[PDB]
Design a protein around this ligand. Structure first.
Ligand SMILES: NC(=O)c1ccc[n+]([C@@H]2O[C@H](COP(=O)([O-])OP(=O)(O)OC[C@H]3O[C@@H](n4cnc5c(N)ncnc54)[C@H](OP(=O)(O)O)[C@@H]3O)[C@@H](O)[C@H]2O)c1
Ligand SMILES: NC(=O)c1ccc[n+]([C@@H]2O[C@H](COP(=O)([O-])OP(=O)(O)OC[C@H]3O[C@@H](n4cnc5c(N)ncnc54)[C@H](OP(=O)(O)O)[C@@H]3O)[C@@H](O)[C@H]2O)c1
Ligand SMILES: C[C@H](CCC(=O)NCCC[N+](C)(C)CCCS(=O)(=O)[O-])[C@H]1CC[C@H]2[C@@H]3[C@H](O)C[C@@H]4C[C@H](O)CC[C@]4(C)[C@H]3C[C@H](O)[C@]12C
Ligand SMILES: C[C@@H]1CN(c2ccc([N+](=O)[O-])cc2)CCN1S(=O)(=O)c1ccc(C(C)(C)C)cc1
Lengths: 265, 263
């Protein structure tokens, strides 16, 4: 996967057709708004239409080349697959798939909640796979890009987020493996995994409101995510701590993977 | 917190161990090793005839008990029943060795969502269900949970995406609850094992074409899993090369988690 050795330029997204999921709020909404401000075509999704409409409206107000929404739950694999189709017609193509949404989750110990674990896998992980499969043909045409939004808990272990972490680890294991597949098959679709720390979205602020954890600004975060996709980077790291930003990489893993891949064929 | 001792076989003598996917491969050799130790075993898998055969050689080997209970971990109900059924058959549970996997598909991923889902269900979700159901008894003996995983559950490889997803998920989930059990003072240890190429028939069938590094003896591999589990180690790394286990360590992650919990 060859990234561009350029500096990012906001114009790179002008006229581009982009899906963003879980975009009625949080980092997703903020991504829609940056893409809007860049004059991109944008289709957003989430379960609730009212909140989605506001985003759509302000996107056009912000200068979006076009902007729509389709509401639905990503518990529905059928909705997921269909959403990408409807969204493809709407824009006449696809340059970028931004996979962002999660099921509602809050900090808690794990006792018996298999139903939360499975819904997490289904919504947080499986639905991302179904959306990728549904979007690849269009993405092969544009030579597009999959952006997968992940978490520190998707690279290291923390208490209170077991089912969430499982699903985020899964994303890494899956998409990191198909990136290597796309590179032998010579599929020219980039895959960017984003490892975010605590971000000041309203939901996240509510879920931790109860010690001191410094949150990072959602607007800058959203842009760092778009920048990584645009530039076809493998991983984007974003946290408020410089120590965390550093320690969340895995140089051992890069070396090993590189030795294996220039070794096997 | 590991046990501050050298391993000695008799630690397992009398203990109540479940071993899943124990009809063949590494699972089978763990049943056997635990048997020469004196443990009470109960194995499980889908293969009735073969389970029977192993259970029988376990009795010949020194085991204090040997029972099998065939079924598929695609079935969460049977997974839940199985631990209860096995708990009775033993009057307690000391060790839960979680090892089974669905059949892994060595190929480019294209559109088989159902195979991804099934990998997640069998390879990961069923491990959660089994653990949920074996907890109460594990708490009472202050027992151990062993989770078997792979090079491909720590780093990424092409051709095994669904499997890598499931093994990665094992790491997140069980590493997260390990930190939860420490702070809520649950005295149940958790061991994640990371295995390179082991010479099981399954593996050798899989790597037959290409030429790799020497595969490692499944009998040694199985014992090291039991050892680490017994000593309550957090992680066991096993490959025929020490270089592999050196290269696979991630000190960054260890330091970052130390930082988060001094806090
Ligand atoms: N903020 C953080 O501290 C943080 C940290 C690490 C990683 N991240 C990652 O950043 C991404 C965005 O998180 P956020 O904090 O911005 O969350 P958020 O503000 O809570 O936004 C979640 C979005 O997902 C949608 N959603 C929820 N359930 C859905 C379902 N079943 N089907 C379809 N859409 C659903 C929501 O809309 P509806 O409810 O209307 O459906 C909403 O638009 C996530 O992947 C998260 O893991 C965030
Ligand atoms: N061998 C290696 O090179 C290697 C490398 C990395 C990781 N590992 C890990 O080591 C563990 C064991 O590997 P192995 O090579 O020993 O595998 P194996 O020889 O293929 O045995 C897998 C076991 O799982 C059982 N199983 C399959 N589907 C099942 C289902 N639906 N329900 C219940 N049981 C099922 C199989 O029994 P039945 O068909 O009789 O049901 C079999 O006993 C796995 O977790 C694997 O990830 C091995
Ligand atoms: C053999 C490879 C890994 C080899 C590797 O990654 N090595 C490359 C170079 C590493 N080194 C730098 C150490 C060597 C170079 C310097 S050195 O001098 O040391 O060679 C590993 C990685 C993924 C593994 C499969 C999965 O588990 C799924 C499945 C589980 C079953 O149960 C058994 C079958 C199967 C198909 C597994 C078989 C095997 O187990 C695989 C292929
Ligand atoms: C540092 C943050 C927050 N984390 C966390 C973990 C544990 C606790 N705790 O109070 O024990 C508090 C916070 C988990 C890891 N990260 S994160 O950025 O991966 C993250 C942020 C927000 C969440 C939600 C879904 C709980 C809001 C989960 C993970």
């Amino acid at each position: 996967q060859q990234p561009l050795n350029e500096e990012f330029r906001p114009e790179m997204l002008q006229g581009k057709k982009v899906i963003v999921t879980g975009a009625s709020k949080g980092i997703g909404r903020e991504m829609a708004y940056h893409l809007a401000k860049m004059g991109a075509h944008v289709v957003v999704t989430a379960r609730s239409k009212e909140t989605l409409q506001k985003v759509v409206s302000h996107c056009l107000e912000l200068g979006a080349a076009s902007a729509h929404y389709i509401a639905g739950t990503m518990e529905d694999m059928t909705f997921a697959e269909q959403f990408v189709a409807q969204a493809g017609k709407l824009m006449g193509g696809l340059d970028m798939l931004i996979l962002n949404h999660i099921t509602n989750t809050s900090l808690n110990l794990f006792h018996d909640d298999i139903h939360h674990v499975r819904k997490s896998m289904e919504v947080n992980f499986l639905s991302y796979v179904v959306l990728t499969v549904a979007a690849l043909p269009m993405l092969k045409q544009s030579n597009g890009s999959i952006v997968v939004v992940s978490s520190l808990a998707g690279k290291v272990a923390y208490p209170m987020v077991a089912a969430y972490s499982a699903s985020k680890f899964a994303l890494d294991g899956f998409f990191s493996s198909i990136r290597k597949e796309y590179s032998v098959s010579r599929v020219n679709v980039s895959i960017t995994l984003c490892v975010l720390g605590l971000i000041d979205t309203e939901t996240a602020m509510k879920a931790v409101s109860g010690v001191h954890m410094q949150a990072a600004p959602k607007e800058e975060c959203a842009l760092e995510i778009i920048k990584g996709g645009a530039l076809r980077q493998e991983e984007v790291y974003y946290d408020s701590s410089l120590w965390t930003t550093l320690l969340i990489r895995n140089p051992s893993r890069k070396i090993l993977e590189f030795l294996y891949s220039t070794s096997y064929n």
